[PDB]
Structures are given as structure tokens and as C-alpha cells.
Write a protein that binds this ligand. Structure first.
Ligand SMILES: Nc1ncnc2c1ncn2[C@@H]1O[C@H](COP(=O)(O)OP(=O)(O)O)[C@@H](O)[C@H]1O
Ligand SMILES: Nc1ncnc2c1ncn2[C@@H]1O[C@H](COP(=O)(O)OP(=O)(O)O)[C@@H](O)[C@H]1O
Ligand SMILES: Cc1cn([C@H]2C[C@H](O)[C@@H](CO)O2)c(=O)[nH]c1=O
Ligand SMILES: Cc1cn([C@H]2C[C@H](O)[C@@H](CO)O2)c(=O)[nH]c1=O
Lengths: 313, 313
């Protein structure tokens, strides 16, 4: 039985995610390692035009008081649906080939993904929500749509001090981006809350029993994503969340619970970061594929994605 | 082992769906039959304000040339996310309790749902796409997000001549609706294409082998939803769909394939329609629940939904 290893490099933008994985795959590691790049072409052309631009422009006009939060929210929402679509469809076709977890044993194939579905379906929307360009109900709608967590979902979140992050953020500006530190802070905070949420849950956390603590390495509820959703728009007159919104948080918990997060330190040289990623790989969960044909089908799948939707990896 | 029966009454609006199910549950059928109503309160208040109004107004202004197709599309998209959210979250929490199909045997509990997730995630968006207020890429994004089809998903689509439909459409106008026959035709056509798509697939249909037939009771490809997606925005220079868009159609097929559709004729009296629905029930697939506690948890779930998000069933 062959094994597949799936790694999702994620975290806030402009940290060294692209720089470090492209070096990772640049070790001449046969054909057993494949890199699935950010689908910039989908975002800029295929799905709609200059979406990244659309987003950064829209937050700007909002900040300059040129549009209402309502108008911002509508645009931001449709924008995000577009951002994550490539994520969703890939995961959707990759589902029927992922079998149970085979412990931590030569992975016949290794997929290094650039971002996991939660990035566009949960992480960014939540930041926009913090930036005032997204409604909490809009966020929970994406949450309710997050696909079931597949076995062996290894997510590598990054770590890098604010100052060094800003510098690197400056050097690399995606086509249509605008330097927005407020967003840099929101995105950073959301990702921190996420990692904590996983831990909190994996240590027996139950958002329902701890909800009262809000209503006033062993992270408490207050240090998790759940705090964001204690907004007035979501609270019934009796002070409890409405059942729809509670169930969404339930689904949030079910999805996050079974994810394996690792924290790659980026505060170092491209070589080092590459080595560290590689070092982490040793301890990541592998899984068996459902059919003998899965590996080639999967190998080719990634290749097709990368070819058709990557700008330059 | 207890069994659950799940029925999804769907089809275009203003056909008698509410009128006929409320009579169905009105036979004094103990506590074994539960009706999950349209979540109007979520649409009108909880999720955002007067969404149904937002939609009908937005299509109107578009038609009057007061907004661009682009502006229409953005609004329409976020609107729809909001429309289906209650659908998505319910299905999401109902997932872990649905086990395999137990043939067609007294269903311990029977849930009569008002619309299935595909209504807001596929059916309506596709109509708006036809109305020019939604982009095909927007539609396929919702498609890629349709949750895995659960066992025993029984979907009852309705049948009623255009003339009789229009009349009934007039008598019942949801808060904020606008009589739009163009939409009535688009919605009707989409739902027809859907039923055909199921059949087509269940008779060994493969959209990939039949794609060429487009590129020019045994329904051919041309009579299915697949025809809608042969749009220029989705076609590569070489005449084939781009791989992202193809995979989405793949996911469309995987989702539709395992659904059980039935066609309830509405061209009759409320009593008759009720009897016919009841008659169909006999031949619908049941499934076992995953835990002994599932039934009560599920029974209560439906009750909570109905209570908190139904206007008057
Ligand atoms: N280890 C590193 N040390 C210093 N600068 C780096 C390092 N890795 C990447 N960079 C630079 O910082 C910017 C952001 O990195 P990049 O990998 O391109 O972003 P992202 O995290 O968004 O994928 C780029 O200009 C890149 O050259
Ligand atoms: N069997 C029927 N014959 C004639 N009119 C009907 C019948 N069932 C419902 N109606 C009427 O047609 C309108 C639409 O029906 P309704 O069930 O309310 O809509 P929907 O299909 O959208 O749920 C209502 O005014 C209703 O009174
Ligand atoms: C994944 C994702 C990225 N982005 C932005 C962050 C970066 O500028 C760029 C991804 O590199 O797009 C979003 O705005 N939303 C998203 O969902
Ligand atoms: C389910 C759904 C209904 N509708 C409209 C049709 C009806 O006017 C009303 C549902 O009864 O809302 C949409 O516009 N989009 C949807 O996704």
C-alpha cells in the first residue's frame, strides 16, 4: 500500500511561504515531490478580473469613507468566494482518493500546497470582518461551507516578528495589492487565534462550556477564534447565540479538531527555512490512497492545477 | 436499529410546496413526522435584512438598466450565500448521524424539509445566471461547495403546467418578491434540467464523453444542466473547458448521481397533492442513524430550526 503525504503551507501573506517551498522542491527530490502554487491566474483572469485588486481597492474606499460598510461587505464576500474556489474544487476531487492515516515510511508522493481551503473560507473573511468590510453572518456562512477535514491534513503555520514581516511584506506586493498594516495585523491575529483554537480543542476544549468565560500552552476560550463570534448581530435577546450561529461554531470545531498544525519559524535565511520545513516533514501524518491509480491521478491533478492556474509557482 | 426517512420537497417557488406539506403533517401523524420550514426569519432578519427583497429589487434595477451586470452579480452572489446558509449548517450537523441506506419498514422519524441545499447552492444561482444577474464562474463556485450527498437523500420535485403555476404564483408573494415571469421560466427550466441530469447520470451518463454533442426518458447531455456551462467565459482557446471548471462539473456529477428524485404532480387539489406525497413516501429510501441518541438529537434539531427560523411554517 502506497502512502501520500499532504502539506499545506499557510499563514498570513508575505512571510516567505513561496520563497521557502520553492527551495524545498529545489533539492532535486525526484518526481516524488509536487508543489501546488497559488492560483493567481484564476484570481486575476479566469474567475474574475483582478480580484486581489478588487479587495484591496474596496477596503481602501471603505476606509476613505467612500462606500458604506454594507457595500464593502457585498463586494468582499463575492470576492472571497472567487478567491477560494480553486481551493474548494481541488479538495473536492482529492477527497475520494484519501484513505485513513498511516501513522507518520517513504511517502510515495508528497504534495506541498500553497494554502488550505480555510484560508479563503475562514481566515481571510474573519480578518475582513475585523477590518469592518465583512459581516459576522457572512463569515459563518463560509464556515458552514468548509469541506470535511480529510485525513492527514497537515497545516504548517508560520512565525515571524511583526517588524521583519512588514519588511518582507514590502518587498513582495502581489499584482493589485496595497500596503495595509491594519490588514497585516488582523490577518496575523486571526492566524494566531486559529492555531490556538486547534490546540484548545485537542486538549478537550468545548466552546459551549466555556462560552460563559467570554460572556463577561493551555489556551483558554478567550484566545481562540470563538471570541470573534460574540458579536451583537449574532446574539439573541437572552444573551445566547442563535442556534443557527451556534451550529456554525459547532461545525467550526468539528473541522478544526482533526487538523495537524506545525509552526515553521521564518525568522531566518531561505536555506534555513527550507531545511526546517524539510525537518518538519519527517513528523507529518501520511495516509493511504483509495486506489492504486490514485497516486498518478493525484500527481497529474496537481500538475494540471499548477500549470493552468499558477503564475510562476 | 431505528430508521430515519428524509424527504426534501423542492422545485420552483409558488407551486403548492408549503400548502401540500402542511396538510401532510396535518393528518395527526403522532410525533414521528416533523416539518422543517423555509427559514424566512434568517433571510429577512438574522442573516441580513430583507434578502428576498434585495434579490428581486436587484434583478429589477438590472433589467431597467440602472446597474451593470457586474454590480448585479456581486449583490446576487452574496445574497445567495445568505439564502442557503441555514441549509448548509443544518446538513452539516445532520451528517454525523446519517448511516447507510436501509432499503426503502416503519421510519422511526420522518423529516419533511422545505428545500434541499442544492436549491440555494445550485438551482437559483443557475437561474440568475440565465437572467444575467449571476456569472457562470460564480455558479460553479457554489457547485464546488455543495456538501457530499448524504445517504437517503430523497428529493421530491414538482410538476405543474405554466398557466396554473403563474396563477398560484400570483396568490402567494413572499415578503419582498416581485412578479417576474422571466425568473419563473428560468427557475422552471433549471429544475427540469436537474431532474434530467439525475436520470441521465443514473443511466450511465458521462458528461465528459458527451461534451462533444454540445460542442456543435433517455435524456441526452443536451437536456441536462451541463448545457448551461458551455459558456465562452469558461472555454479555453482550444475549445475545451478549463480544468478548474471541468472539475467543478465533475463534482456536480458526483453530487447529483446519488440523489433519489420523485416528481409530485401539483395540478390537483391540496387534499390530492397531500395524498400523492404520502403515496410517494412509501417508496423512499430510509437510513439507519449512527447512534441511539441520533433520533432525539435530530428530532429536537428540526424543532429548534423550525422554531427559530420559520415564519409560519
Ligand atoms: N527567509 C527569508 N528571509 C528574508 N526575506 C525573505 C525570506 N523568504 C522570503 N523573503 C522575501 O520576503 C517577501 C515575501 O516572501 P514570499 O515567500 O514571496 O511571500 P509569501 O509568504 O506571501 O508567499 C519576498 O520578497 C521574499 O523575497
Ligand atoms: N393544490 C393547489 N391547488 C391550487 N392552489 C394551490 C394549491 N396548493 C397551493 N396553492 C396556492 O398557490 C400559492 C402557492 O403555494 P405555496 O404552497 O404557498 O407555495 P410554495 O410552492 O412556494 O411553497 C398559495 O397561494 C396557495 O394558496
Ligand atoms: C487566500 C487569500 C488571499 N488574499 C490575498 C492576500 C495576498 O495579497 C494574496 C495572496 O497571496 O491575496 C485574500 O485577500 N483573500 C484570500 O482568501
Ligand atoms: C431558496 C431560494 C429562494 N429564493 C426565492 C424564491 C422565493 O421568492 C423565495 C423562497 O420561497 O425566495 C431565492 O431567490 N433564492 C434561493 O436560493
Amino acid at each position: 500500500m502506497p502512502t501520500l503525504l499532504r502539506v499545506y503551507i499557510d499563514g498570513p501573506h508575505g512571510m516567505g511561504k513561496t520563497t521557502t517551498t520553492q527551495l524545498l522542491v529545489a533539492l532535486g527530490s525526484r518526481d516524488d515531490i509536487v508543489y501546488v502554487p497559488e492560483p493567481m491566474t484564476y484570481w486575476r483572469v479566469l474567475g474574475a478580473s483582478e480580484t486581489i485588486a478588487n479587495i484591496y481597492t474596496t477596503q481602501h474606499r471603505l476606509d476613505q469613507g467612500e462606500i458604506s460598510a454594507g457595500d464593502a461587505a457585498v463586494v468582499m464576500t463575492s470576492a472571497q468566494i472567487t478567491m477560494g474556489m480553486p481551493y474548494a474544487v481541488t479538495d473536492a476531487v482529492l477527497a475520494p482518493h484519501i484513505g485513513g492515516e498511516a501513522g507518520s515510511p517513504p511517502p510515495a508522493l508528497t504534495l506541498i500546497f500553497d494554502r488550505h481551503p480555510i484560508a479563503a473560507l475562514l481566515c481571510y473573511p474573519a480578518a475582513r470582518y475585523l477590518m469592518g468590510s465583512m459581516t459576522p453572518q457572512a463569515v459563518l456562512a463560509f464556515v458552514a461551507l468548509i469541506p470535511p477535514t480529510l485525513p492527514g491534513t497537515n497545516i504548517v503555520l508560520g512565525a515571524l516578528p511583526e517588524d521583519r514581516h512588514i519588511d518582507r511584506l514590502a518587498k513582495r506586493q502581489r499584482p493589485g495589492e496595497r500596503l495595509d498594516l491594519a490588514m497585516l495585523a488582523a490577518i496575523r491575529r486571526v492566524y494566531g487565534l486559529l492555531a490556538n483554537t486547534v490546540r484548545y480543542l485537542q486538549c478537550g476544549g468545548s466552546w459551549r462550556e466555556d462560552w460563559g468565560q467570554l460572556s463577561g500552552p493551555r489556551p483558554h476560550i478567550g484566545d481562540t477564534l470563538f471570541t470573534l463570534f460574540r458579536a451583537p448581530e449574532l446574539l439573541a435577546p437572552n444573551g445566547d447565540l442563535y442556534n443557527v450561529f451556534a451550529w456554525a461554531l459547532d461545525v467550526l470545531a468539528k473541522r478544526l479538531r482533526s487538523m495537524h498544525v506545525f509552526i515553521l519559524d521564518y525568522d531566518q535565511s531561505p536555506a534555513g527555512c527550507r531545511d526546517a520545513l524539510l525537518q518538519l516533514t519527517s513528523g507529518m501524518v501520511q495516509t493511504h490512497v483509495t486506489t492504486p491509480g490514485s497516486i498518478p491521478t493525484i500527481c497529474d491533478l496537481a500538475r494540471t492545477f499548477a500549470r493552468e492556474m499558477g503564475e510562476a509557482n
